[PDB]
Amino acid sequence: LEVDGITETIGTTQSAMYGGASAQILQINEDIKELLDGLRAYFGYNMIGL
Amino acid sequence: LEVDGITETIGTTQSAMYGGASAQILQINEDIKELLDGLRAYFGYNMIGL
Amino acid sequence: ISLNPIQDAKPIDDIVDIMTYLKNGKVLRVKQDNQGDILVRMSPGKHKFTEVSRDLDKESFYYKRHWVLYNVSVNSLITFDVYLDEEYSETTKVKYPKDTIVEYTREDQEKDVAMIKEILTDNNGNYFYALIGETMLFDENKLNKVKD
Amino acid sequence: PIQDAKPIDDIVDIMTYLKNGKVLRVKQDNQGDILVRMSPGKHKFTEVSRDLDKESFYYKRHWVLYNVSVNSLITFDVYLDEEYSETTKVKYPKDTIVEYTREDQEKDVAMIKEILTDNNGNYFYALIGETMLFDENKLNKVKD
Amino acid sequence: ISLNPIQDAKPIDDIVDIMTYLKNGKVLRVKQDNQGDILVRMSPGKHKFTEVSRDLDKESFYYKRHWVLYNVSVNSLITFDVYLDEEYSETTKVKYPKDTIVEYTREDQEKDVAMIKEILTDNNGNYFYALIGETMLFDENKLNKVKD
Amino acid sequence: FINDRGIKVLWEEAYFCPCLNPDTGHPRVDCPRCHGKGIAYLPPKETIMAIQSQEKGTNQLDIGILDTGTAIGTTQLEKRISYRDRFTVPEVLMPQQ
Ligand SMILES: [Zn+2]
Ligand SMILES: [Zn+2]
Ligand SMILES: [Zn+2]
Numbered sequence: 001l002e003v004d005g006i007t008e009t010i011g012t013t014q015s016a017m018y019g020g021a022s023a024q025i026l027q028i029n030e031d032i033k034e035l036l037d038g039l040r041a042y043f044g045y046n047m048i049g050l
Numbered sequence: 051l052e053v054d055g056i057t058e059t060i061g062t063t064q065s066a067m068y069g070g071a072s073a074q075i076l077q078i079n080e081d082i083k084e085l086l087d088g089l090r091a092y093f094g095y096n097m098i099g100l
Numbered sequence: 101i102s103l104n105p106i107q108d109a110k111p112i113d114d115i116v117d118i119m120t121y122l123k124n125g126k127v128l129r130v131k132q133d134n135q136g137d138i139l140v141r142m143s144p145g146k147h148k149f150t151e152v153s154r155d156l157d158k159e160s161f162y163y164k165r166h167w168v169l170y171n172v173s174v175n176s177l178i179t180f181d182v183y184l185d186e187e188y189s190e191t192t193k194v195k196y197p198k199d200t201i202v203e204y205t206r207e208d209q210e211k212d213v214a215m216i217k218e219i220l221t222d223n224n225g226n227y228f229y230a231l232i233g234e235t236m237l238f239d240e241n242k243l244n245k246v247k248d
Numbered sequence: 249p250i251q252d253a254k255p256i257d258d259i260v261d262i263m264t265y266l267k268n269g270k271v272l273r274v275k276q277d278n279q280g281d282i283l284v285r286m287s288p289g290k291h292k293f294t295e296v297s298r299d300l301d302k303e304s305f306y307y308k309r310h311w312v313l314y315n316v317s318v319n320s321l322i323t324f325d326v327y328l329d330e331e332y333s334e335t336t337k338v339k340y341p342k343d344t345i346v347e348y349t350r351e352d353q354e355k356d357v358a359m360i361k362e363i364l365t366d367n368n369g370n371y372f373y374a375l376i377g378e379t380m381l382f383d384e385n386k387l388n389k390v391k392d
Numbered sequence: 393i394s395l396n397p398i399q400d401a402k403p404i405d406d407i408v409d410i411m412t413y414l415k416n417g418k419v420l421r422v423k424q425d426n427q428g429d430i431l432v433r434m435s436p437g438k439h440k441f442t443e444v445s446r447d448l449d450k451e452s453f454y455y456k457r458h459w460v461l462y463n464v465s466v467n468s469l470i471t472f473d474v475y476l477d478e479e480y481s482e483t484t485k486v487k488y489p490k491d492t493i494v495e496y497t498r499e500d501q502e503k504d505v506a507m508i509k510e511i512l513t514d515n516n517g518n519y520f521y522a523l524i525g526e527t528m529l530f531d532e533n534k535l536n537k538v539k540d
Numbered sequence: 541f542i543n544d545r546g547i548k549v550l551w552e553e554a555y556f557c558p559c560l561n562p563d564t565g566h567p568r569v570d571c572p573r574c575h576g577k578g579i580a581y582l583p584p585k586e587t588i589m590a591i592q593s594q595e596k597g598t599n600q601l602d603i604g605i606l607d608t609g610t611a612i613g614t615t616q617l618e619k620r621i622s623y624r625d626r627f628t629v630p631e632v633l634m635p636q637q
Contacts, residue, residue, distance in 0.1 A: 005052075005054075006052070006053060007051065007052040007053075007057075008051060009051070013064060013065065013066050014066065015066035017066075018066035018067060022066070023064070023065070023066070023067070023068055023069035023072070024069060027069060027072070027075065
């Protein structure tokens with residue numbers, strides 16, 4: 001906005017190909033992948049005879 | 051922001067593609083991977099007979 | 101084969117009853133001319149003060165209204181119509197409210213003006229209109245409004 | 249007792265009196281007193297006056313519109329203008345921080361609960377939490 | 393089932409005792425109105441001079457305070473409250489400090505004002521308040537403050 | 541935007557006092573509504589306004605020193621200011637001697 005010589009200007013994280021919180025969502029995926037894989041090792045793989 | 055002859059401009063590390071602390075997190079990962087891979091050699095792989 | 105008559109949201113004119121309801125804590129809804137429709141409330145507890153909310157819907161388990169302190173003016177209440185929030189609702193935004201003078205075509209091809217005394221609804225949600233001097237209830241399309 | 253004050257409790261009574269058109273007196277904090285009034289005629293709206301003295305041939309009140317807030321009315325004290333008393337000549341006003349000594353020679357603070365006088369003009373004061381009366385000298389005006 | 397009373401950080405009013413403590417080298421903490429809270433110290437050794445630090449915490453093995461030379465003013469000390477850094481702490485930022493006049497509701501539904509003479513704490517960290525003329529200790533929620 | 545960049549200010553409208561002399565057309569020296577100035581004022585209205593270019597222009601003359609300068613302001617929407625309206629900014633203090 002430019003009003004009577006005043007000027008206010010903002011550029012957000014929102015973009016045509018990235019969402020506003022998608023920076024955090026991506027980081028949460030990187031966090032879950034480390035956490036989730038490490039926890040499946042505690043329970044282990046399933047097996048059934050045939 | 052420009053008011054009455056005084057103006058200021060700031061550009062943060064925030065971006066649509068990466069969060070403001072993403073650089074610190076990504077360096078933490080680089081250290082943890084080295085730190086964790088080296089420490090696994092202190093304990094070693096797991097084996098079970100079958 | 102119909103639904104019983106639906107009451108219109110009576111506007112409140114007397115300031116005294118408005119203040120009495122407010123002191124009782126019952127919610128009020130104020131139709132501001134310039135900046136839309138708002139809710140007005142008296143703060144609970146000892147620290148008495150008026151509060152406003154623009155969370156303009158009936159309170160629900162999934163939708164809880166947020167109240168901001170505001171210095172509501174007497175003149176605002178007087179000049180603006182106010183309704184009890186228990187009544188004013190989307191249920192029936194009838195085109196021709198009760199006590200409204202409307203123009204209706206009679207069987208003799210002579211247009212007459214009558215005041216709507218009773219309004220009801222049916223299964224389809226239609227608006228049956230009762231006009232003084234006649235028993236048959238008219239429909240929305242048949243009627244007409246005359247303004248000024 | 250003294251008849252110098254008759255504050256209104258309910259705002260509903262205030263609105264009822266305003267409908268009747270009687271003037272009101274509304275106190276302020278570290279600020280001038282105010283008179284409030286309902287305008288006559290077709291259009292009804294609140295009016296205020298910074299003047300306080302009674303109307304006379306040599307003194308007339310001035311009225312203007314103002315968006316008076318109900319918060320002021322409910323919070324601040326309100327009186328009928330005609331029946332208000334200018335001052336009661338006592339050292340301490342009502343609802344004022346004061347200090348005293350209890351029956352066991354223990355010092356304690358309190359606010360004035362009631363202002364009283366005898367027929368000879370001697371003034372007695374009752375404090376909160378103290379049923380007995382206190383002399384003007386026995387009290388002490390606490391500094392803010 | 394409680395913890396013993398906690399002393400409040402007594403402000404120091406007399407300039408003479410302030411200067412004596414400073415000459416002894418004991419640290420002082422000055423609450424500047426405009427630019428926050430600072431520490432004041434006398435330099436050790438022969439080269440005597442006043443020093444300031446904004447390393448505003450208790451000294452710790454892992455957190456050592458850095459001292460900058462400054463020309464502290466007498467008027468600054470006089471007009472600004474000063475505390476001994478051994479006392480002033482985050483431990484108890486009580487809403488109603490000692491000697492404060494507070495308004496409390498009595499059992500007879502009559503609000504009275506009393507000065508807090510003693511304050512203590514319990515397992516949960518609550519703030520029990522002692523008021524003159526009464527033995528029972530009140531709680532934070534019951535009380536109220538009157539300002540001006 | 542205006543509420544953000546503005547400053548809290550009291551807006552009081554202006555209107556000619558009734559005390560004006562009907563024949564000369566000039567005001568009474570002292571009256572409650574206007575203190576000698578020929579223009580009275582209404583009750584104030586709390587308002588946020590933006591202000592720029594504030595100038596304390598000093599003119600030194602035979603009559604003495606005089607303070608006069610230009611300050612450019614920008615209001616909110618729907619507000620219709622009038623000539624010789626008056627504003628006062630409690631927040632900002634000005635030194636004088
Ligand atoms: Zn299994
Ligand atoms: Zn092993
Ligand atoms: Zn005048």
